[PDB]
């Protein structure tokens, strides 16, 4: 993965013009410093290994965190799976138009103690369950529901105090690549929704406490980490300048191209 | 000389006498779909003399206070001959293009244009909670134009056409990462771009998905002195290359 | 019962590790691959494409297309300066935002050469000559054309070929430089001057423009990936 080394150069007086080109051809000039001045011969041992597509994207990044309470009605979490709610991972994946990768998925579950009124609260270790529902299956409506059986849905159980849980997901798509951008509609009538929301059908992730509420309430929080493996990328794209506003679309409020200085000659 | 070209496609011909090179895609030429990459089982239609020919869109005027124009690419030719009549009767279709932008002036005019072809160019809305409608995103074979100011948020379904953000929330100077070419009135006269089929699926419906967008943006504005010709037009011709269709049903 | 012994670093989550993990959907059949044009393998091919740099940041030009145009006219004296900016490709606000300077904000170190292309978007009847200099640090900024001719320079004559390339070379004590603003690893200055005047005929406008592009050579390299300081967030996007 080594970079190219420079060669020696002599004084020239010729009809060859390496520096003069035409930028109107849509073509970048391939000149080196050993064409426009006198150079010495060095050999470079530098590598281009840390700027690969694999080394750039294969790193864990937090995509969501949700809370749920042990002794409350309406106390279980859900999340419709996407990658467009955090600012840092959304900007890295959107330097390319199409992507294709396997996934690695890690959860970090903590807990806290809520102000009860009983004397001598003493709880055992807590067990949590995270169930993944593919699009079209039945959803849970409460904590003590039949849908947490997981006959065919994959789910993971975890006891507090151990190493964090971790799975691996293949390239689960209908098309030949994941699409970061989509210029079109859902209906053929060209009404309704517009954009990447027409392509996002990846499921829902549910979270609950398996234990029952003994004497004090407990508020847990699970953080979700994504990590792309075996990455392929096509059609690079300029990085995003304006700040992100929504999850479903591209909309923005306009901003200047750079920050400003006082004069064109000031350094 | 390297300044003359001649492109023949069907019964149409383009000649030019001063030009740069022709930019072809990401290094690939348009070609028909293979057998190990296809998914639809029925036999495709390849008419290829009636649709693969040069179609000329309308002309726009380059003024001094001008900001830019854009066209959505498999929608401008949706009423053009037998290319727009095959799109209505068929469900799927794939197509590469060749685009020839032409703008001529004298040696006493000055200016510069950026001619770029961007795939999957989602435009943004002025009101931050909605999405723009179809009539604002594209017109058939007529240009939609940018503005040098900012559209207000009181307009519900309109496109945010601040030209320095290029409508998509990026820097307009970084648009040279796509296949592009410049028209410099000092040296150039036309720009020719050949684009292959770029999508994540082998075929796609040509009515609810525009996979290419042609933007023409003046970085250096038009300027001339008194007595010179003030009316300067810009004309775009687009020819499909290796078009084929699947799924014949009623006319829609 | 094979006897083992667990070391420090057990049951930890280091976010840049490389292990194997059991699959959640076993015997899944993925969609077969397709030949899509434009496959990128290294991020050092995006940075080698040149992009227009906004030299004209004068506080009412940033929200317009006037930030990219450098004004060039016909003078009455000789030796005036066109522009000038320091060569900090990841810290200086001129090169902060270009296609090379946005990849550099993900990394900490950089090393290699840098190209600078200049296109003359004037009339076909206008002439001119320019001096495109680069000065290594240690002294100040060159204040005259006589100071700037003592560095690495090229003399550009406009004509049929309307572009010229200034290739600022790698002159450094260390093998790498810092992307952030560091006084120990400063890189120098890039200036432009009038060699001769801009001589136009009658009925030609005497005020022209110049575009500038910036890219990298084939020996460019980056190191020590980090997070960018440009994107930011307070609440979740919904």
């Amino acid at each position, epitope marked *: 993965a080594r970079v190219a080394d420079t060669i020696s150069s002599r004084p020239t007086n010729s009809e060859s013009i390496p520096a003069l080109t035409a930028a109107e051809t849509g073509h970048t000039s391939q000149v080196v410093p050993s064409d426009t001045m006198q150079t010495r011969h060095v050999k470079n041992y530098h590598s281009r290994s840390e700027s690969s597509i694999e080394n750039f994207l294969c790193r864990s990044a937090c995509v969501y965190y949700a*809370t749920y309470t042990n002794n409350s009605k*309406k106390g279980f979490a859900e999340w419709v799976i996407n990658t467009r709610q955090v600012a840092q991972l959304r900007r890295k994946l959107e330097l390319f138009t199409y992507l294709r990768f396997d996934l690695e998925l890690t959860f970090v579950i903590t807990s806290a103690q*809520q*102000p009860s009124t009983a004397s001598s609260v003493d709880a055992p270790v807590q067990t949590h369950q995270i169930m993944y529902v593919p699009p079209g299956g039945p959803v849970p409506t409460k904590v003590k529901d039949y849908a947490w059986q997981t006959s065919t849905n994959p789910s993971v159980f975890w006891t507090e105090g151990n190493a964090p849980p971790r799975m691996s997901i293949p390239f689960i798509s209908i098309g030949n690549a994941y699409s970061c951008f989509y210029d079109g509609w859902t209906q053929f009538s060209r009404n309704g929704v517009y954009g990447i929301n027409t392509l996002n059908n990846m499921g829902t992730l549910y979270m609950r406490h398996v234990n029952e509420a003994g004497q004090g309430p407990i*508020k847990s929080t699970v953080r979700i980490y994504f990590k792309p493996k075996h990455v392929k990328a096509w059609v690079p794209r300029p990085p995003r300048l304006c*700040q*992100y*506003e*929504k999850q479903k679309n591209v909309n923005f*409020s*306009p*901003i*200047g191209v750079t*920050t*400003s200085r006082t004069d064109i000659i000031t350094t | 000389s390297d300044r003359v070209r001649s492109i023949t496609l069907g019964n149409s011909t383009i000649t030019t006498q001063e030009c740069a090179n022709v930019v072809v895609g990401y290094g690939v030429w348009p070609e028909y779909l293979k057998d190990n990459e296809a998914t639809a089982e029925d036999q495709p239609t390849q008419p290829d003399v009636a649709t693969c020919r040069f179609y000329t869109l309308e002309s726009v005027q380059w003024m001094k206070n001008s900001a830019g124009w854009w066209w959505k690419l498999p929608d401008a030719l949706s009423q053009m001959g037998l290319f727009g009549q095959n799109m209505q009767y068929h469900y799927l279709g794939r197509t590469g293009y060749t685009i020839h932008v032409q703008c001529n002036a004298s040696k006493f005019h000055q200016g510069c244009l950026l001619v770029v072809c961007v795939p999957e160019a989602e435009m943004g809305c002025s*009101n*931050l*909670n909605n999405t723009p409608e179809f009539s604002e995103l594209s017109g058939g074979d007529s240009a939609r134009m940018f503005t040098d*100011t*900012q559209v*207000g*948020e*009181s307009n*519900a379904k309109k496109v945010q056409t601040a030209v320095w953000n290029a409508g998509m929330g990026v820097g307009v100077g970084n648009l040279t990462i796509f296949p592009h070419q410049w028209i410099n009135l000092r040296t150039n006269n036309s720009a020719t771009l050949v684009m292959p089929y770029i999508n994540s699926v082998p075929m796609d419906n040509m009515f609810r998905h525009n996979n290419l967008t042609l933007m023409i943006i003046p970085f250096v504005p038009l300027n001339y002195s008194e007595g010179s010709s003030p009316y300067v037009p810009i004309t775009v011709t687009i020819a499909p290359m290796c078009a084929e269709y699947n799924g014949l049903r009623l006319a829609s | 019962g094979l006897p083992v012994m667990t070391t420090p670093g057990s049951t930890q989550f280091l976010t840049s590790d490389d292990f194997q993990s059991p699959s959640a959907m076993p015997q899944f059949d993925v969609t077969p691959e397709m030949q899509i044009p434009g496959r990128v393998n290294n991020l050092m091919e995006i940075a080698e494409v040149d992009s227009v740099v906004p030299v004209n940041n004068t*506080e009412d030009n*940033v*929200s317009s297309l006037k930030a990219y145009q450098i004004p060039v006219q016909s003078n009455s004296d000789n030796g005036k300066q066109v522009f000038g900016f320091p060569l900090q490709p990841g810290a200086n606000n001129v090169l902060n935002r270009t296609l090379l300077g946005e990849i550099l904000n993900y990394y900490t170190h950089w090393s290699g050469s840098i190209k600078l292309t200049f296109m003359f978007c004037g009339s076909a009847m206008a002439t001119g000559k320019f001096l495109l200099a680069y000065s290594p640090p240690g002294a100040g900024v060159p204040k005259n054309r006589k100071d700037a001719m003592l560095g690495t320079h090229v003399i550009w004559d406009v004509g049929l070929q309307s572009s010229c390339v200034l290739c600022v070379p790698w002159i450094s004590q260390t093998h790498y430089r810092y992307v952030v603003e560091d006084e120990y690893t400063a890189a120098g200055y890039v200036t432009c001057w009038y060699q001769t005047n801009i001589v136009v005929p009658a009925d030609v406008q005497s005020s022209c423009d110049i575009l500038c592009f910036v890219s990298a050579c084939n020996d460019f390299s980056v190191r020590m990936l980090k997070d960018t300081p440009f994107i*930011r*967030q*307070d*609440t*979740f*996007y*919904q």
Partner: antibody
Framework: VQLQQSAAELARPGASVKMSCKAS????????MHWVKQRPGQGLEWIGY????????EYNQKFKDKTTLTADKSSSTAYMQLSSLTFEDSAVYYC???????????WGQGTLVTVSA | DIQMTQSSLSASLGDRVTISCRAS??????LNWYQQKPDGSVKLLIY???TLHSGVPSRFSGSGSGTDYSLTINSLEQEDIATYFC?????????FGGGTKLEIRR
């Protein structure tokens, strides 16, 4: 990060005032800054905002002809000028920084405007 | 314009308080709740129907869909005695609801 407003002001009916909101702790030209008015017996009310990078302002249709918003990038301040002052314009005026979509995370402390003779 | 209809509530400490506010049309879960202290400082509490801002204690919760929405404080303290507004972020312009003040019961 915090926003710091100016002192309380007093004016005659027919005069003009000019309030400020000195923002520190962040890049001023990135986020727009909105102005909210609270009359002491009723609820909050939106006036308008100004994009500091492009100097573009947008007003509510009730305060379209009376208020004027300006800004400067050097000292990182946002000004608001009230004109043709009547007895309805004696309230508390807040400057707020709009978050991701429609949220106001950071507010000013408010200036008390009152008209009298 | 969307009318945001919400005047004074009374509750003892350690009790559950419920503040509600009704819009005119469907706003589709784009509601925010603010809190104005009696010295005159405003802060964001819940930046969706239910999602809490960072730095807000767990006493506060939100619920609702469509037109009817609500705010719940399950255990009242002395720090939570303030005025609460609801604001919609759906259409132009931004409209705030009226206040709702809390007070001690007896």
């Amino acid at each position: 990060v915090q926003l710091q407003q100016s002192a309380a002001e007093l004016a005659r009916p027919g005069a003009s005032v000019k309030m400020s909101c000195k923002a520190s702790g962040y890049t001023f030209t990135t986020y727009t800054m909105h102005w909210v008015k609270q009359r002491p017996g009723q609820g909050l009310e939106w006036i308008g905002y100004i994009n500091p990078s492009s100097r573009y302002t947008e007003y509510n249709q009730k305060f379209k002809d009376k208020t004027t918003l300006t800004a400067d990038k050097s000292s990182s301040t946002a000004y608001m000028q009230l004109s043709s002052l009547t007895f309805e314009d004696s309230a508390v005026y807040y400057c707020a920084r709009r978050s991701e979509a429609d949220r106001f995370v950071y507010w000013g402390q408010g200036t008390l405007v009152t008209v009298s003779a | 314009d969307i009318q945001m209809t919400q005047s004074s509530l009374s509750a003892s400490l350690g009790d559950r308080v419920t503040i509600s506010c009704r819009a005119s049309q469907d706003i589709s879960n784009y509601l925010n709740w603010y809190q104005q202290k009696p010295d005159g400082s405003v802060k964001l509490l819940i930046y969706y129907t239910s999602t809490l801002h960072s730095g807000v204690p767990s006493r506060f919760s939100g619920s609702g869909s469509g037109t009817d929405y609500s705010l719940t404080i399950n255990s009242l303290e002395q720090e939570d005695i303030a005025t609460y507004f609801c604001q919609q972020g759906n259409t132009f312009p931004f409209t705030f609801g009226g206040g709702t003040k809390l007070e001690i019961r007896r």
